[PDB]
Amino acid sequence: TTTLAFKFRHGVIVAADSRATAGAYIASQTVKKVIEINPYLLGTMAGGAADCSFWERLLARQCRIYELRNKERISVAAASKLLANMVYQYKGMGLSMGTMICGWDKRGPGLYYVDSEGNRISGATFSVGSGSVYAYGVMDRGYSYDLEVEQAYDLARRAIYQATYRDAYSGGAVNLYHVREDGWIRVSSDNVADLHEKYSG
Amino acid sequence: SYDRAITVFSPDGHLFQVEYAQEAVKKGSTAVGVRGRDIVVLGVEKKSVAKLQDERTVRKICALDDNVCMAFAGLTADARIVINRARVECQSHRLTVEDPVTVEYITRYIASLKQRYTQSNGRRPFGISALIVGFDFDGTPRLYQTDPSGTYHAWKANAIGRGAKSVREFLEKNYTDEAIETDDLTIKLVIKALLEVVQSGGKNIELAVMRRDQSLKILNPEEIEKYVAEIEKEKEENE
Amino acid sequence: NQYDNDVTVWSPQGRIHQIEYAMEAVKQGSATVGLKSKTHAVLVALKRAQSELAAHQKKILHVDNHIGISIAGLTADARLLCNFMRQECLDSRFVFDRPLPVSRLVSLIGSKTQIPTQRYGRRPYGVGLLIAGYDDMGPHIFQTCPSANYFDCRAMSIGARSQSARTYLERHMSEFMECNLNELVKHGLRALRETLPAEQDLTTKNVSIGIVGKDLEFTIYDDDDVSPFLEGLEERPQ
Amino acid sequence: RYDSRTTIFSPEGRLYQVEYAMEAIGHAGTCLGILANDGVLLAAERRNIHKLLDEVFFSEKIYKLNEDMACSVAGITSDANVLTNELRLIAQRYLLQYQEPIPCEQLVTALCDIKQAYTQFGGKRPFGVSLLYIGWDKHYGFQLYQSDPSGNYGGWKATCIGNNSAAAVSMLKQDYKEGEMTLKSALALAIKVLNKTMDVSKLSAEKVEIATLTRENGKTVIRVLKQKEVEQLIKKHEEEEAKAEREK
Amino acid sequence: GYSFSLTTFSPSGKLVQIEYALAAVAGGAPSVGIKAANGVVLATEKKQKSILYDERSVHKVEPITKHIGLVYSGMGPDYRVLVHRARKLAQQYYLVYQEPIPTAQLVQRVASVMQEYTQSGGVRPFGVSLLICGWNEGRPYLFQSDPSGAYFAWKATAMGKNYVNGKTFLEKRYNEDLELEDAIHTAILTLKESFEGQMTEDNIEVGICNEAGFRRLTPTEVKDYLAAIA
Amino acid sequence: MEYLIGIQGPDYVLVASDRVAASNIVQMKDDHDKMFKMSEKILLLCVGEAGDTVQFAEYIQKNVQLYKMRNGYELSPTAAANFTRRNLADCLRSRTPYHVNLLLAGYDEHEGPALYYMDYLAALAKAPFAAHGYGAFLTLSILDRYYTPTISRERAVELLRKCLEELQKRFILNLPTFSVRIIDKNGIHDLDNISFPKQ
Amino acid sequence: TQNPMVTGTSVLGVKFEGGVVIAADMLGSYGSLARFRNISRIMRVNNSTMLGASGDYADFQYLKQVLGQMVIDEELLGDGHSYSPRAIHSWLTRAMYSRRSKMNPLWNTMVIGGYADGESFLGYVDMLGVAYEAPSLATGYGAYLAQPLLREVLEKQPVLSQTEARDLVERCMRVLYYRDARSYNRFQIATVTEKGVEIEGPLSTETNWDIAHMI
Amino acid sequence: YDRGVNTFSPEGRLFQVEYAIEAIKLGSTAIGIQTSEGVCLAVEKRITSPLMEPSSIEKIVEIDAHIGCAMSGLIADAKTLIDKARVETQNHWFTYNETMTVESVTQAVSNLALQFGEEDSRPFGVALLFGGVDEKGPQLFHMDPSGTFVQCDARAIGSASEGAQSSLQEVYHKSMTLKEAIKSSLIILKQVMEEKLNATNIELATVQPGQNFHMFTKEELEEVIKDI
Amino acid sequence: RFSPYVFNGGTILAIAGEDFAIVASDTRLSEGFSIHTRDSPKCYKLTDKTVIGCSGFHGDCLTLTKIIEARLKMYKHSNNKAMTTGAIAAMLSTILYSRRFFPYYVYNIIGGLDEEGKGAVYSFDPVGSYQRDSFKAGGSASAMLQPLLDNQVGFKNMQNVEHVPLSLDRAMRLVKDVFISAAERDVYTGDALRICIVTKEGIREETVSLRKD
């Protein structure tokens, strides 16, 4: 398991693996951990399957209720905020959820990071998972705010390539979405073996 | 069929107690309120000091959030319940979501609670009508009115109490588009409405303004005396 | 008249006439005829219109694979006891894992309607249930009442001017037990046509038929398998 | 078939139990809180002044409620005792909450909400009691408030009681003092108020009650003053009547 | 789920059913109680309707504590209920503070409960006036409550029938300073003032509240002192 | 765990927190804030269970703002601290206790500035200076050497520089970036982030 | 029940042609002590089915009481309808599942034999709610002991008679008396048929001990 | 007398639900038409004041992306049914990955259409027109405060609904088309109304299979006004 | 003390065909060192486009199955229509989440056709996550079966091997071969095989026996 997301000049970069195993046994390699919240909001599956699936579906539910009642698109701080309010109710009760919350704001890019321990923050770069520190190595190496679109594509694509490369728990497909001002855009979903024939030489 | 219980309807389907709740609203004190393009402004009339008491406790205009401005109609203490209730509510919305609390949401709260409060049994409904001024969404000036039935409703200008259709007809005879974005002409508009008060006593007028980013600014009855001075002077210009 | 107000208050003749008012509400419903053979239970309702563009409201609804009913009177209480009805179907259908005997179920319906016919703060229900059910011993046609005195029969009819159809049930109740499903059905519309004012004829869209058998699941039809039932007919002897 | 109004408007649109409760208020004894900056006072009127009593209570209308706050009262007595025990419960709970005394205003409005809930819903007999409020704070100093059965209240300097005190309030407007905090001149003025409005001949001390509430260095002590100084206030005020008849 | 008490304000402001309960107390049995310099003497008028009746069953002078006695003017069956309430309440004071409850605290708590019965729904108020006395901390005390929850503190008073007449008689003959037997003396005087002629050991029943403690007196000493008490 | 400081002056309160929000291996966030503007003269600092810190800051912060909008004026920092510790004492004997470690910094028109220091066991304190973690040990030793009751705010600044420089000397973690406020007669004034080049 | 005090032992049950025969002993051993060597471990339901059980005999008294109450209920309905033995298996399955679902089990091991509508029936009911159907059931150790004999004869021949299956049960109960420490030489054999429910008396076994003379 | 919620009439039912169906008629009118090309709908706003902002008054609200609405009578009670109905459809998507069918939405509201209870509050007085496009194409629905729901081909409500439904039955057939039903519908509107037909009086609600979204026309509404 | 969970066995195979869905599972029921029966089919034709396979705890299998059928009656008799397969996966996911803190010791696979009549296999976990897949083998023989399913269905790790779509009877040969080969090594597997085929015209069943030890 390894995901990452970072905002820059032109929206936000969303990247993930697709490997979900079961202990030492591979369950699947095609797990779309980036749960698409809205045409304007995206979330991650970072620890917990029914936690992120349920609770992010309940959050997308609640934002839909918000937009119906107020006729108004919600802010990402409000969504991560009330998400943390919902997760906080079961503190210490054995629930893993450390997801990333991504979208667009009237104040610009929307990037928030919420854990099951009430670790709701904002920031600029995030990486979650087993091989997350790998992606802090390569991503925090190659990070700049003024990077371009394909530049950040090969940056984060390289980053998942390294993190899935050293991690035995990360692999499968390389999911890659791109949050814009108007709304996100699916970039690609690439194989690590294709990035190994591509990136090995 | 009778003018008793809030539950039954007339043979043509009416709620006489809602209608009677509108009566003490119509027999209440008069207050006016307009939005400027930036400087929203309002003011109650009929201060009516009686020589032996303090009047900071009888202040009929307050704020739930700093972006919003409170007024009401009818009686006082039920509106005090609604005000402190909506301090808990606006502060709770503040606690849940870190947004500035919006006028549309809080008026859905007040009109909704007044509605279901009117639905519930053996409970005397609120005989008030609130006037809610908020310039929040990039300071976009908004003013809402409520109803004893509990219907929140936006206007562009407002006047309540006795003669609300009279002073409202004055605002129909005064609704210039240039009164806003010349916030001093909005000041002359507020002095025009307080000039068109049912008594227009000059000392019983209490006005409060906000430039959509400032706080609730309370005026003085010498600046307002200068506003009656320029009002009578402009009337001399009309002469 | 001052006593004729509530459920608890006995009349000075002991006849609480609000129950009779609920009976009058049951008489406001449309006409419908339930019947059974020795094997096959068929019940037919009369649809009415609100307007020309308005669809004809049905009275027959499916409940269980062996249970079908009609209704006359109130609608929200009918759906109330429909949800309670299917509820009690899935109760023993879940736990006991068997279909229901009918008499125990309708007895639970009478005990269900006992309290709203008993206490203050509770009104009776305008109810016109004609009941077709299948226990181990085959078809059973019951009928209900707001007095909660459910009646077993071989065939009944309730609604407006249904007494003519009741006389048809009397003069063909020997015929009903022996004849099959198709001509028994056209006996059925040869009761509903006597529930009609004679200046109009039983058309297609204003009628529907539910059929349940010992080997047949309860199924309702509208104009489509009813048009082969609307054939094989004679006109009224004018 | 046995329902009173208890929560409903009169036909046209007015109120019933509130008006009749105020009619119960007007038929009572008389109290007052006067203008004082260095403290505040309360005059009061003794009711049921029959001689075979004991009078060992020392406080009949007065209720020293927490430390630096008291209240005269007008209405149903034991209902008012319920409201004073509840009131000391509320402000004493505030003192538990912050370990700080009340600012008194949210206390006054709180009790106005207590009676007010009985006005709106739960149609019973409400409290037909109006009562005074004296006190001190760090924000406005010594204060005066007036309870109402309508949930309303008054931040006063010269208060009002019912039928015996309308002429007293007209005496407060026509004889309104301003600027001086002189408690003794307020005692002669109140002795004029109870002298005319109280129909007791020569203003007997056993028909009246006086107690003050002054600032002492952080304590804000409450002088529930005895009867002999009331007696010399009687002789002093009748000496002021002699000064009044010097013009004859 | 009824009850908006019963009670509304009159157009005068009065409370009519409470006034009717005061009419019931005015039609109540006569009694008198006198706070002397040492204790308080309670004396009731208790005549049986039939000569067959036993007086050992019903008893009027009733303690709540061993220094606290109490009588009434109203009805016995409600009197047992409110007395039982005061017993439980006094035991609760003894549980909290482990100390005999002062009579002022009895009148505050019990009178507050009776005020709750005035502002209490479901039925009627308790049309019983109470005479409460106890020799608490040196001084005896004499406290008179009402059905409407209020109370007073008397040197000597009387309730029941002809209570204004014996009230004027105690106003005449009584003073500040007496003793216990002097209060029994003028108490028998005011008792025969309004009572019937045939007054024996069973026609009355007397208790005292000594500073040494409450002492419910018997028809023995009632028959001894009241053997031509003047 | 990490650090706080609440140095009391004659008319000022100098407070400093970190900006670190590490999680057990790496530093996740290097620009964190824990300085919580309760009012125009009252400030909140806390180190504890990160869920309980935020939710507690919601309830107490917004509840103080409910006092401010309702009564329309500011609490005393003493009785405000009594309300917070009151809520901790309510939270303690409960199925959901909080483990947060507070310190408060208020200012009075009458009493001037004030320093309060709480516990995860709801302890009231009135101190000249208080802290958390093991930097509590090091910095209270150093400031114990250099305490003056009548000391200037610039000696507090440069003394804080010195004590932080000794904090860079023998402390095991990183802790680069430290935010600082100062309280005066006006109220809250931000001093800059305090970071140090090591080599 | 966390701690079952008084338990039974293995119960044998098998269908045959036109009915189900179920036998069990009469032993109420409290631990290794046979404290109650004279009990009855079978409830005769009215005409179609019949219950054998193991585990807590007090629970067997309880479910005897509740089930007997329910049979009294639908009998006193008089609608001409009873409970099917499959419905008994259904309600008992739901009852045990809801029982264990509150983490408070009833220490039992139940076997329902119902011949009705010409159809033999033999449903197992677990304490854990695991419940199924089988032509031959053998609880306790008899799953490890006589169940391969049961499946041996059933794979040898599908259909059987009452005499074949009956003497078969006699041999198997004899074997369980040879090597079961919770066995006792007193048992009852019962049989549901279309003739009805039949309970036999305290039958006993006939051992062999000729190998004891060997060394 | 005036036997309310717990007494039937001696012939029929409640004198209070009769007062609610009575209390429908005071409301303004609205006409939806189920075209197979897509259900259109319109409503009279009945704007009084010049200060009375036109978009402040809502009649058509969007339950689901292909579901509009239309009310008749009690405003915030209807809007309560709007928000709760949107919750119920959100539960159906939440637990079914798919839109609740519009008839089952109307049955979901129609459960508590008559579940008024002052014991064990008051009954409502608002009639509802529902426009949707389910899996069976376009759907036009009408319920009542008495819960007797019926699917309608084209339904008029509110004031003057007798002549509106009568002239509607004159102009209606099965093979009607979209803009035909639009301009014919506003013909019936300016027949039954009293004010001059401008942009302020009315608003449209157009659901289609290809135009599931946007049950509205924005200032080309004005163009269709000047198309007549 | 009382342990609530026990392993009853099971081995489920589901293949989302082009217009079909083949769900086969052994009927052998065992526990510990005891076969309870050799006939316990885990395949259940709920609708004509849905057959479910449920392994793990047996009482939760029967219980949950009856709850599923009850909610089918709730949806249809509420709604006059049947569920789609993904709606069943969603509702089931809300069930398995609704018993989060006391989970079912149960594995689940739902087979059946979509509204396009193409096969839709939904694997499950005992907490309630799912996705639409093409083929899953649950139970004890999952690691026994999945790599050969990758070799034949997915054609994984195969050089110069084109992707012919697998026909129906070729997939039947696949099913019989993998249940024989898995039957030779699993102790939880044998004695029979319940085969279900979800077509656009009905569901076909076929039980093919296995070895008897």
Swiss-Prot record, chain A:
Question: Which residues are recorded as binding bortezomib?
Answer: A49
E.C. no:
3.4.25.1
- Cellular location(s): Cytoplasm; Nucleus
Q: Tell me where it mainly resides.
A: cytoplasm
* Induction conditions: Down-regulated by IFNG/IFN-gamma (at protein level). Induced in breast cancer tissue. Up-regulated by sulforaphane in breast cancer cells.
Q: Provide the reaction this enzyme catalyses.
A: Cleavage of peptide bonds with very broad specificity
Q: Which GO terms describe its cellular component?
A: centrosome; cytoplasm; cytosol; extracellular exosome; nucleoplasm; nucleus; proteasome complex; proteasome core complex
Cystine crosslinks: none
Q: Keyword annotations for this protein?
A: Cytoplasm, Host-virus interaction, Hydrolase, Nucleus, Protease, Proteasome, Threonine protease, Zymogen
Q: What class of enzyme is it?
A: hydrolase
Q: Name one GO molecular function term.
A: threonine-type endopeptidase activity
The active site is formed by T1 (nucleophile)
One GO biological process term is: proteasome assembly
Quaternary organization:
The 26S proteasome consists of a 20S proteasome core and two 19S regulatory subunits. The 20S proteasome core is a barrel-shaped complex made of 28 subunits that are arranged in four stacked rings. The two outer rings are each formed by seven alpha subunits, and the two inner rings are formed by seven beta subunits. The proteolytic activity is exerted by three beta-subunits PSMB5, PSMB6 and PSMB7. Directly interacts with POMP. Interacts with ABCB1 and TAP1. (Microbial infection) Interacts with HIV-1 TAT protein.
The family assignment reads: Belongs to the peptidase T1B family.
> What is the protein name given in its UniProt record?
Proteasome subunit beta type-5
Q: What is the lineage of its organism?
A: Eukaryota, Metazoa, Chordata, Craniata, Vertebrata
Q: Which residues of the parent chain are present?
A: 60 to 260 of 263
Swiss-Prot record, chain D:
Where does the record place it?
Answer: Cytoplasm; Nucleus
Q: One biological-process term from Gene Ontology?
A: proteasome-mediated ubiquitin-dependent protein catabolic process
Under the heading Pfam families, the entry gives: Proteasome, Proteasome_A_N
User: Which Gene Ontology terms of cellular component type are present?
Assistant: cytoplasm; cytosol; extracellular exosome; intracellular membrane-bounded organelle; nucleoplasm; nucleus; P-body; proteasome complex
* PROSITE patterns reported for this sequence: PROTEASOME_ALPHA_1 (PS00388), PROTEASOME_ALPHA_2 (PS51475)
Is Isomerase tagged as a keyword?
A: no
Q: Which UniProt keywords are given for this protein, alphabetically ordered?
A: Acetylation, Cytoplasm, Host-virus interaction, Nucleus, Phosphoprotein, Proteasome
What residues bear Phosphoserine in this entry?
S10, S72, S170
- In this UniProt entry, the residues modified to N6-acetyllysine are K124, K173
> Could you tell me which SMART domains the record lists for this protein?
Proteasome_A_N
Query: Any S-S bridges, and between which cysteines?
Result: none
In the induction comment, the record states:
Down-regulated by antioxidants BO-653 and probucol.
Q: What does this protein do?
A: Component of the 20S core proteasome complex involved in the proteolytic degradation of most intracellular proteins. This complex plays numerous essential roles within the cell by associating with different regulatory particles. Associated with two 19S regulatory particles, forms the 26S proteasome and thus participates in the ATP-dependent degradation of ubiquitinated proteins.
Which family is it part of? Belongs to the peptidase T1A family.
What is the name of this protein?
Proteasome subunit alpha type-4
Gene that this sequence comes from? PSMA4
UniProtKB/Swiss-Prot annotation, chain G:
One GO term under biological process is:
negative regulation of inflammatory response to antigenic stimulus
Quick one: where is this thing mainly located? cytoplasm
**Induction, as annotated:** Up-regulated in fibrolamellar carcinomas.
Instruction: Say if the entry is tagged with keyword Transmembrane helix.
Output: no
Any one GO molecular-function label of the UniProt entry: lipopolysaccharide binding
Give the highest taxon in the source lineage. Eukaryota
Query: What subcellular locations does the record give?
Result: Cytoplasm; Nucleus
> List-wise, which residues carry Phosphotyrosine?
Y57
Annotated Gene Ontology cellular component terms: ciliary basal body; cytoplasm; cytosol; extracellular exosome; mitochondrion; nucleoplasm; nucleus; proteasome complex
Similarity-based family: Belongs to the peptidase T1B family.
Disease named in the record = Proteasome-associated autoinflammatory syndrome 3: An autoinflammatory disorder characterized by onset in early infancy and recurrent fever, nodular dermatitis, myositis, panniculitis-induced lipodystrophy, lymphadenopathy, and immune dysregulation. Variable accompanying features may include joint contractures, hepatosplenomegaly, anemia, thrombocytopenia, recurrent infections, autoantibodies, and hypergammaglobulinemia. Some patients may have intracranial calcifications. PRAAS3 inheritance is autosomal recessive or digenic.
Q: State the name under which the record lists this protein.
A: Proteasome subunit beta type-4
Provenance organism: Homo sapiens (Human)
Upper lineage is: Eukaryota, Metazoa, Chordata, Craniata, Vertebrata
Which part of the full protein does this chain span, and how long is the full protein? 46 to 260 of 264
UniProtKB/Swiss-Prot annotation, chain I:
| Phosphoserine: residues bearing it | S34, S40, S134
Span-the-membrane segments of this chain are none
| An example Gene Ontology biological process | proteolysis involved in protein catabolic process
Phosphotyrosine is carried by which residues? Y122
* N6-acetyllysine: modified positions: K176
Question: Which protein family is it in?
Answer: Belongs to the peptidase T1B family.
**Pathological condition linked to this protein in its record:** Neurodevelopmental disorder with microcephaly, hypotonia, and absent language: An autosomal recessive disorder characterized by microcephaly, intellectual disability with absent speech, severe developmental delay, short stature, and hypotonia. Affected individuals also manifest aggressive behavior and have hearing loss.
Subunit details? The 26S proteasome consists of a 20S proteasome core and two 19S regulatory subunits. The 20S proteasome core is a barrel-shaped complex made of 28 subunits that are arranged in four stacked rings. The two outer rings are each formed by seven alpha subunits, and the two inner rings are formed by seven beta subunits. The proteolytic activity is exerted by three beta-subunits PSMB5, PSMB6 and PSMB7. Interacts with SERPINB2. Interacts with RFPL4A. (Microbial infection) Interacts with HIV-1 protein Tat.
Quote the protein name from its UniProt record: Proteasome subunit beta type-1
* Originating species: Homo sapiens (Human)
